[PDB]
């Protein structure tokens, strides 16, 4: 009576469906007393304004990961369920815009022209929705194109030690997509989405300036989640980037998505799991780290005529801090991905800058995503190199080896020097075909190692002037005729040396 009245008086008097009162704060991860009805992965607006998604629905007390600071939070406040799982504006308005994780333009070109909203997770296109890939795309790096041909829909993991131009490898791909960008067709046009996770604002800002300089910022979308920005938001950042990608793909338009670096995504999810007290896996990266990565990566596709015709191309990037690929996170990713694009540090110093060590680089998808002409010319490029690797290994001793082995040794040396790539220079495939022809048909085997660099510049110039008929044809027909090969043979010979 009096005790029941007084009981009602000291009682909250709310069923805490749609709401709950915070209890126990700290660690940037909250715990609420209440929230009896709650949907999973829903967004809950804490009444200190901060919003936090909910990842633990542990009995009676919901473990809500903040998207902001807890210094804003003060214990005992109400949190009221937004009732919406996280969603992002997606549109073509992202073209020439930097956006933060929640899609708020941090480039400050004001509100995105968002032709849709999407959901944090959107399931990958099935077996049947994909078209069987046959879409070539060329990065403008001859070694990449020739040795590990890139297609659209495939995942190729760029791996190698941190900031050894780790960023720069990716940006090179973007620059050669100018050739396609200029091109009218939407199937040609890659609307390229560069995701930068954990990276400092200054780095990104330099990058956008470089993109603006190279005038590609136009067809570029920059999705960013800088280091300061919240760990849930970092985890959520690839998946909402992915959603933007699926929209392009759905539209029939092609795109390419760079996920640099997934390694910091893992650390973010690690932080969450260890402060949600969820069981931490090997290297303290949680047990369902694989689940996140696999779903993200398998969203990449090329679609058939069932839906669209677009294809999102993916380039995941893992920067191996230890350089250890047998570590849990690289290992998991390596299994997921269709390729590895291993880089070697020693070879960076050796003067290939960027340096790609193609011993551990694979593309299982292969040369169906390689231009027919380019398949022909780089056909025995691989054989020569493979022989060179073995031959070179014995050869360092300094002994005068048998001549047959030194035919390999001499040819092989020239090839490596020929391959060498310089930062910020993408190469036109039409003018990558001659160089690989020349080398493979051994016209440069004789040409001294020292002057290979000199010869290359001049050779292109000489062809540009004289055998410009050849260049047009390589572009136009994309497969080299016997006649064209012969013409090319004569041409290479014609420029006997510089």
């Amino acid at each position: 009576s009096i005790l029941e009245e007084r009981i009602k008086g000291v009682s909250d008097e709310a069923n805490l469906n749609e709401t709950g009162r915070v209890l126990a704060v700290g660690d940037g991860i909250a715990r609420v007393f209440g929230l009896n009805n709650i949907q999973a992965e829903e967004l809950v607006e804490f009444s200190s304004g901060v919003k936090g998604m909910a990842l633990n629905l542990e009995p009676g007390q919901v473990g809500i990961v903040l998207f902001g600071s807890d210094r804003l939070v003060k214990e005992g406040e109400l949190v009221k369920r937004t009732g919406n799982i996280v969603d992002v504006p997606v549109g073509p308005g992202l073209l020439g815009r930097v956006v933060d994780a929640l899609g708020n333009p941090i480039d400050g070109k004001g509100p995105i022209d968002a032709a849709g909203r999407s959901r944090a997770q959107v399931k990958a296109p099935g077996i049947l929705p994909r078209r069987s890939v046959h879409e070539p795309v060329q990065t403008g790096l001859k070694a990449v194109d020739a040795l590990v041909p890139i297609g659209r829909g495939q995942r190729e993991l760029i791996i190698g030690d941190r900031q050894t131009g780790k960023t720069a490898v990716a940006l090179d791909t973007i620059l050669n997509q100018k050739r396609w960008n200029n091109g009218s067709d939407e199937s040609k046009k890659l609307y390229c989405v560069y995701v930068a996770v954990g990276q400092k604002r200054s780095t990104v800002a330099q990058l956008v300036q470089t993109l603006e300089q190279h005038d590609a910022m136009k067809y570029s979308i920059i999705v960013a989640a800088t280091a300061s920005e919240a760990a849930p938001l970092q985890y959520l950042a690839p998946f909402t980037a992915a959603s933007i990608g699926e929209w392009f793909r759905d539209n029939g338009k092609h795109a390419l998505i760079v996920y640099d670096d997934l390694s910091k995504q893992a650390v973010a999810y690690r932080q969450l799991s260890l402060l949600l007290r969820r069981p931490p896996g090997r290297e303290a990266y949680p047990g369902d780290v694989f689940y996140l990565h696999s779903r993200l990566l398998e969203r990449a596709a090329k679609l058939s005529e069932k839906e669209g015709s677009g294809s999102l191309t993916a380039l995941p990037v893992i920067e191996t801090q230890g350089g250890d690929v047998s570590a849990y996170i690289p290992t998991n990713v390596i299994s997921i991905t269709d390729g590895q694009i291993f880089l070697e540090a020693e070879l960076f110093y050796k003067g290939i800058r960027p340096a790609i060590n193609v011993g551990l680089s694979v593309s299982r998808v292969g040369s169906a995503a390689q231009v027919k002409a380019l398949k022909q010319v780089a056909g025995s490029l691989k054989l020569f190199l493979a022989q060179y690797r073995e031959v070179a290994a014995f050869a360092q001793f300094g002994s005068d080896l048998d001549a047959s082995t030194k035919q390999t040794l001499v040819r092989g040396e020239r090839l490596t020097q020929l391959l060498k790539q310089n930062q910020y220079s993408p190469l036109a495939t039409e003018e990558q075909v001659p160089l690989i022809y020349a080398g493979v048909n051994g016209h440069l085997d004789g040409i001294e190692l020292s002057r290979i660099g000199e010869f290359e510049s001049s050779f292109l110039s000489y062809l540009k002037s004289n055998h410009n008929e050849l260049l047009t044809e390589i572009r136009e027909k994309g497969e080299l005729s016997k006649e064209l090969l012969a013409s090319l043979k004569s041409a290479t010979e014609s420029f006997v040396a510089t």
């Binding site: 005790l3 029941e4 007084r6 009981i7 000291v10 909250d12 009162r21 209890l23 009676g60």
Partner: protein, 187 residues
């Protein structure tokens, strides 16, 4: 030592308080009056549903004292100290738990026992009495200790019977016998 060791997780501290109720031996009658306090908690459950609600601090302890003011005093000063202790440990979800456990200790001191004869189906009242009798005419109820034999219905526990009391059972069900028959005729 209290009659029967509960193992005493949380509520076992209150079982030791029941040992103290034997020590200041009016606490044995205090276990009857504390059962009356549990009856007050049984009138409580609209407020008891609020009482499972967390976060009542010193104000929660004062609110519990207000419920105690609605009470007449069953379980006395030991019960009041338990109200403070449970308040201090802040848990209503092991409030009734202590009640049930104190009940077990209390009725152990009384010497009442609880048996059960789970069967596939209900059993005769003639059967009920005859087994209670039998148990008294066995060492199981040595007599000096009461019994509350409860037949339970569980058709999942197949035909026949299983008698349970203490750590002692006779299981003359069908399933176990069928199992044995099968095994040997697969051998």
């Amino acid at each position: 030592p209290p009659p029967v060791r509960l193992f005493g997780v949380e509520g076992t501290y209150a079982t030791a308080l029941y040992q103290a109720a034997a020590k200041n031996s009016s606490i044995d009658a205090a276990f009857q009056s504390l059962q009356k306090v549990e009856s007050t908690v049984k009138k409580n459950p609209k407020l008891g549903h609020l009482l499972l609600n967390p976060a009542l601090s010193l104000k929660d302890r004062n609110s519990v004292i207000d419920a105690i003011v609605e009470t007449h005093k069953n379980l006395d000063g030991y019960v009041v100290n338990l109200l403070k202790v449970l308040s201090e440990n802040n848990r209503l979800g092991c409030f009734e738990k202590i009640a049930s456990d104190f009940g077990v200790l209390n009725d152990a001191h009384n010497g009442l026992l609880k048996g059960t004869v789970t069967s596939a189906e209900p059993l005769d009242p003639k059967s009920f009495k005859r087994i209670e009798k039998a148990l008294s005419a066995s060492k199981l109820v040595g007599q000096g200790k009461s019994l509350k034999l409860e037949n339970v219905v569980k058709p999942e526990i197949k035909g026949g019977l299983i008698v349970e009391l203490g750590d002692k059972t006779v299981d003359l069900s069908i399933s176990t016998k069928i199992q044995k028959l099968n095994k040997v005729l697969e051998d």
